Nucleic acid binder design. Structure first.
Ligand SMILES: Cc1cn([C@H]2C[C@H](O)[C@@H](COP(=O)(O)OP(=O)(O)OP(=O)(O)O)O2)c(=O)[nH]c1=O
Ligand SMILES: [Ca+2]
Ligand code: NI
Length: 420
DNA sequence: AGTGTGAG
DNA sequence: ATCTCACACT
């Protein structure tokens, strides 16, 4: 069933207001109440980074000062992420993420895609489950939080699910729609286990590829899951913004919109594959041709040890690193965080990083990074690493006066790679 | 390849 | 993210 890109069952799981839920687990009084998670900033109580769904009803959004949100939601409760060596401390979140990932790994192999989301390949689990119950159909009681995109044509959810279930093939075990339905069953079980063992809620999307799973996950949030079938793709794409498709959120997507004069994914269906290749190249033209028809093949890649570990910090405008002392201090601060993480990495995976990449951005440069250089990473010593990084970046101070740094630095980035 | 692009 | 990480590209 590859010709129609219905060969796999893929799901994407995304935690609802992840940081808020981890905080609600520590301090119970914040549960089922409007609350938020802020990064302490002296001005206005600090910026808000995670908002509960209860608080979103009052118009609360991320990137807005706590006091202004207070005005919008006076009952609003606050949780504050600790700050360390100029950045947020996410140990708590990484550990909760690991908990959930381990729980998901029991049902099918996963691909960790971020701190709060992961792809799941259920093809094998769907086959094995298909043999386990044959002939008896699938009752709606196994899909308490599943939405069937496009149907019908909390009450609506049940009516659409009934219309979906009444038409599912029963005997053809290779039926794409049946495989998706079973995948949604397994995801319902997965999420039930996750809640039971951690108290966390989440959403999921079930379809045939990563792109459709990602779109399906966001259709019915929170604490709900959405199944997007191949037959529902035309309707779903009829008004789906091109820039909302995974990998098309940047320049390529903008280019498609500008060159073809279209806004929705579904409009790409009218162009021929040769036209798309003549305008975007063989590879992107063919990819777009199949993607606008719901076909995509990026495989779900199991456990993978990260290829890099790094951290950085930006110093915009006034904050730009101007003296030599400042650059030395921030390099040391970054290296100390790096050391902490590299140490945990070596403890958990018995591998050591052999290369240190230093990257910096000078004030006034439009590029993301002004330059990058590499040196050996022999010892997990923040002090040593700080001096090595300084040595590769020292040439960049184009000023004979030792009293300052020129041009100033607006970004410092340290990264450990070449693991072995 | 080191840079640029993009997902989260 | 008003950061972490992956990887495509002669
Ligand atoms: C996108 C984003 C996320 N985060 C953090 C906090 C979030 O809890 C975590 C996951 O990010 P998101 O998944 O983007 O958002 P969310 O989990 O808070 O809520 P929902 O999925 O229901 O929309 O990463 C930021 O601090 N700044 C950001 O810009
Ligand atoms: Ca989330
Ligand atoms: Ni020293």
């Amino acid at each position: 069933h590859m010709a129609t890109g219905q060969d796999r069952v893929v799901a994407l799981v995304d935690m609802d207001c992840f940081f808020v839920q981890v905080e609600q687990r520590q301090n119970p009084h914040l549960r089922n109440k409007p609350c938020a998670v802020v990064q302490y900033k002296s001005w206005k109580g600090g910026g808000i980074i995670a908002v509960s769904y209860e608080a979103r009803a009052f118009g609360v959004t991320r990137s807005m000062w706590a006091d202004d949100a207070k005005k919008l939601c006076p009952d609003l409760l606050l949780a504050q992420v600790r700050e360390s060596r100029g950045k947020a401390n996410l140990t708590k979140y990484r550990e909760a993420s690991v908990e959930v990932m381990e729980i998901m790994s029991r049902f099918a192999v996963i691909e960790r895609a971020s701190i709060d989301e992961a792809y799941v390949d259920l093809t094998s689990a769907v086959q094995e489950r298909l043999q386990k119950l044959q002939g008896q159909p699938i009752s709606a009681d196994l899909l308490p939080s599943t939405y069937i995109e496009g149907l019908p044509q909390e009450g609506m959810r049940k009516q659409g699910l009934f219309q979906w279930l009444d038409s599912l093939q029963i005997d053809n075990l290779t039926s794409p729609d049946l495989q998706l339905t079973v995948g949604a069953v397994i995801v319902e079980e997965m999420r039930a286990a996750i809640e039971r063992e951690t108290g966390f809620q989440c959403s999921a999307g079930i379809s045939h590829n990563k792109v459709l799973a990602k779109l399906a996950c966001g259709l019915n949030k929170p604490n709900r899951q959405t199944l997007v079938s191949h037959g529902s793709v035309p309707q779903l794409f009829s008004q789906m913004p091109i820039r909302k498709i995974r990998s098309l959120g940047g320049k390529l997507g903008a280019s498609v919109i500008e060159i073809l004069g279209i806004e929705y994914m579904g409009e790409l269906t009218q162009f021929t594959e040769s036209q798309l290749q003549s305008h975007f190249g063989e590879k992107n033209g063919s990819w777009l041709y199949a993607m606008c028809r719901g076909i995509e093949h990026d495989p779900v890649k199991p456990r993978q040890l990260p290829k890099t570990i790094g951290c950085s910090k930006n110093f915009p405008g006034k904050t730009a690193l101007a003296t030599r002392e400042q650059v030395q201090w921030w390099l040391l601060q970054l290296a100390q965080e790096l050391e902490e993480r590299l140490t945990k990495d070596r403890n958990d995976n018995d591998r050591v990083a052999t290369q240190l990449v230093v990257s910096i951005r000078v004030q006034g440069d439009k590029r993301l990074s002004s330059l990058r250089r590499c040196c050996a990473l022999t010892r997990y010593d923040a002090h040593k690493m700080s001096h090595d990084a300084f040595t590769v970046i020292k040439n960049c101070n184009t000023s004979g006066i030792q009293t300052e740094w020129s041009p100033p630095l607006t970004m410092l980035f340290l990264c450990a790679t070449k693991f072995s």
